[PDB]
Design an enzyme around this catalytic site. Structure first.
Site: not given
Ligand code: HEM
Ligand code: HEM
Ligand SMILES: C[C@H](O)[C@H](O)[C@H]1CNc2nc(N)[nH]c(=O)c2N1
Ligand SMILES: C[C@H](O)[C@H](O)[C@H]1CNc2nc(N)[nH]c(=O)c2N1
Ligand SMILES: O=c1[nH]c2cc(Cl)ccc2o1
Ligand SMILES: O=c1[nH]c2cc(Cl)ccc2o1
Lengths: 416, 416
Positions: A113, A116, A285, A290
């Site tokens: 991730c 973070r 979010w 992506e």
């Protein structure tokens, strides 16, 4: 003693000592998507007491050790109470505070991730008293509604009942809360999200009515208390979407593209103090790339790259012309422009990268390390243009942790 | 039995069995630049016979086993002859054919190289009879000249005398044959290639006259027969360069940028059948992104990104504007345009990626595998836009192999 880590961009050096608290586990499995080391499979028997207690104590110590002003008195009491609960019940229930602490730490410990830095900012919905699929559905809807917050996205997680003996597992068959369907149209052409072909069919095989569109929101397939999965359609009023528009190319909206505003992982497992939570959907979010790069440009997804190419008047027949590089950037610009215009939270990949670099710096100062999977942290575009690319990283599994699970439809025993 | 490998782009599956022939060797050292596992250090004593012979036999079998129409007779004879040479000399000399085969296989086995489809196309210069630095210099010049071929770049390698006892090692102190100098200017500002700061100084400390320019070609620092390194200036007529011009932006040449046409690794070690060659410079041709993205855009290098940004009239103060993505692409376009215009061999990253995918497919069909380092194979830009990104890979060390070496100036014992 410590592993040396170098950032070839700034030349800075870091000393990783946190990797010593790493857990368990034939060449180097470098670019493996779903390795077993990151997967926590099913069970048919409770966690052996000899294993449970040690992990439980380990966690309780971590929880109390996190406080600035120590609570030795409470710490000792909790240690004794947990031990007894295990002795008399064969397992134990986390206190709300402990669970909250666990979800944030697991996120903090997610090597893949990039977001973070927000680890401590997470809303937790305690659904450990849930019993039926209908109840799971209600909880999920409440989650989606809170998280969406009319475009001002908020990170949240809903925790369902922990695994008992492994035969009464709560599970979400969906990979994500909100996801588009993929149809194998009659004329041979694929329609919608090609990545959800198989799962879409399963939904149809369970009674879901296919609408054969490009952006059909898939239904929730919920498994409660180890029982057969029930299908529930997500109320459209709860699914916020963004229509894709380009700031300069007016023909962009003619593409008829759009995407959902809520990225929410639904099929992962939360591991904490020996306890396992097979159902704990969470969300954050979006990071622009992506949608614009993976969702829209992957050949196995929407594959809109060539189309946007021609529309731009590029030499789509000459790779060396770098038309692909030019097209993908405009799509990314469109995605960012649309979200901002429609007041829906989003962050570009450059701002995200820097944010993570700051986080990693914070983590090394706080606990001497930060588990990171370079392969996932580096954006699908502008690799070396981001600082994350030049940063050496150490990938390792800590605890708490979010593990992958085996596809439910492959291990589930149907009642009827 | 075999490791399953998946390409998420095409869905194709591959069975890796080649990893079983892998060699040797504390969390997962994922993004480590120079790990020890990829480094073959110095020695002060000859290779122990018990180790040498086994590796030697292993290699001889591989060499003869490569032929379509087997030569059993010759194979047996070679096996006996090699053994005797080791018994009577403590080592052995490869036949020209064997060496040629070795250099190509080592390239074929380079996990970090995206250009391996060209593995069988390599010119070999046998300099194993070399004795002095002046001789090394002459060989290197011949190499550069042949490889440059007036812009029509040709892949080549020059093999110097193999390591004997480790005290008479032939070594090139340069990281690459052609490289620009980096100066720590008086006004505090860095000039030239910031990555060669330290090495540039060493050249100055050895008698090289610094010209304090932006593109000063560094001199060859050659170590022959374990003796002290001598400095040799590369004849300018041998260094082909390309002036950077943009097909549309006329102001691009005002940047005064240029780059050398010959990418040549100079400090690596060739390992084959137990033998080690501390000096074996090799080269191929450029892939556009190396110059346009790494050399020109890395902050630790030429860092021209912001400058090109303003010139384009972009919002260089707003990351979300994606100006960096827009700028870097134009620079890549410039690099490709200039090389093509000046008739100098070059390949864009997209064409390179596909070429490797074809190669990998060829390797699995030929020997059931292809060692690949995903982190290095994926271009510094357009990551997921290339097929290599969606391809799962297995990273492992085979033999022959090109290893890294410890910086010579850190282990060298100065004569005077
Ligand atoms: C606040 C905004 C957040 C952003 C911008 C963010 C972004 C990302 C991105 C870009 C990935 C890669 C996804 C992919 O390629 O499939 C990722 C993975 C992941 N994130 Fe975050 N994230 C956020 C919040 C969260 C939260 C709230 C959690 C957990 C409580 C979390 C847990 C994870 C995990 C476990 C993965 C790995 C998923 C997988 O391997 O498929 N993230 N995140
Ligand atoms: C024919 C054209 C070739 C192309 C386009 C090519 C391209 C590349 C690229 C893009 C890299 C990454 C460089 C970096 O980021 O520092 C690389 C690495 C490498 N290549 Fe190739 N290559 C070619 C020829 C060769 C040849 C002829 C050999 C060997 C005989 C070879 C051996 C290697 C090795 C060992 C590495 C790793 C170097 C390192 O780790 O620093 N390459 N190549
Ligand atoms: C094969 C390869 O590991 C795979 O395609 C990857 C790599 N890097 C990734 N990085 C992110 N962020 N997300 C992904 O899905 C992937 N997939
Ligand atoms: C830290 C990280 O491993 C490093 O910056 C990398 C990663 N990927 C790379 N890929 C290539 N091709 N070349 C490189 O130098 C690097 N460097
Ligand atoms: O862009 C994003 N945001 C994300 C939030 C979660 Cl929880 C997972 C993946 C994500 O990718
Ligand atoms: O672009 C390139 N070409 C290359 C040739 C060699 Cl030998 C090494 C790295 C390279 O990077």
């Amino acid at each position: 003693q410590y592993v040396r880590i170098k950032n070839w961009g700034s030349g800075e050096i870091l000393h990783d000592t946190l990797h010593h608290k790493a857990t368990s586990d034939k060449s180097c499995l470098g670019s493996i998507m779903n390795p077993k080391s990151l997967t926590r499979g099913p069970r048919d028997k409770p966690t052996p007491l000899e294993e449970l207690l040690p992990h439980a104590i380990e966690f309780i110590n971590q929880y109390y050790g996190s406080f600035k002003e120590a609570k030795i008195e409470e710490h000792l009491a909790r240690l004794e109470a947990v031990t007894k609960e295990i002795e008399t019940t064969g397992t134990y229930q986390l206190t709300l505070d402990e669970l909250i602490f666990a979800t944030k730490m697991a996120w903090r410990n997610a090597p893949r991730c990039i977001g973070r830095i927000q680890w401590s900012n997470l809303q937790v919905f305690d659904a450990r008293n849930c019993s039926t699929a209908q109840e799971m559905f209600q909880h999920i809807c409440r989650h989606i509604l809170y998280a969406t917050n009319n475009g001002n996205i908020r990170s949240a997680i809903t925790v369902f009942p922990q695994r008992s003996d492994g035969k009464h597992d709560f599970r979400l068959w969906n990979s994500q809360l909100i996801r588009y369907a993929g149809y194998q149209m009659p004329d041979g052409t694929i329609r919608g999200d090609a990545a959800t072909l198989e799962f879409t069919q399963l939904c149809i095989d369970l009674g879901w009515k296919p609408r054969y569109g490009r952006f059909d929101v898939l239904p929730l397939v919920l498994q409660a208390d180890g029982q057969d999965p029930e299908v529930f359609e997500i109320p459209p009023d709860l699914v916020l979407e963004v229509t894709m528009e380009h700031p300069k190319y007016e023909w962009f909206q003619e593409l008829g593209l759009k995407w959902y505003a809520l990225p929410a992982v639904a099929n992962m497992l939360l591991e904490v103090g020996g306890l396992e939570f097979p159902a704990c959907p969470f969300n954050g979010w979006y990071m622009g790339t992506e949608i614009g790069v993976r969702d829209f440009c992957d050949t196995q997804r929407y594959n809109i790259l060539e189309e946007v190419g021609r529309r731009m008047g590029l030499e789509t027949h000459t790779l060396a012309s770098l038309w692909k590089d030019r097209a993908v950037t405009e799509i990314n610009v469109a995605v960012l422009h649309s979200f901002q215009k429609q007041n829906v939270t989003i962050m570009d990949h450059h701002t995200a990268s820097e944010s993570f670099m700051k986080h990693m710096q914070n983590e090394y100062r706080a606990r001497g390390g930060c588990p990171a999977d370079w392969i996932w942290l580096v954006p699908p575009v502008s690799g070396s243009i981001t600082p994350v690319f030049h940063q050496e990283m150490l990938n390792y599994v800590l605890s708490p942790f979010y593990y992958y699970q085996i596809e439910p439809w492959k291990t589930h025993i149907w009642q009827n």
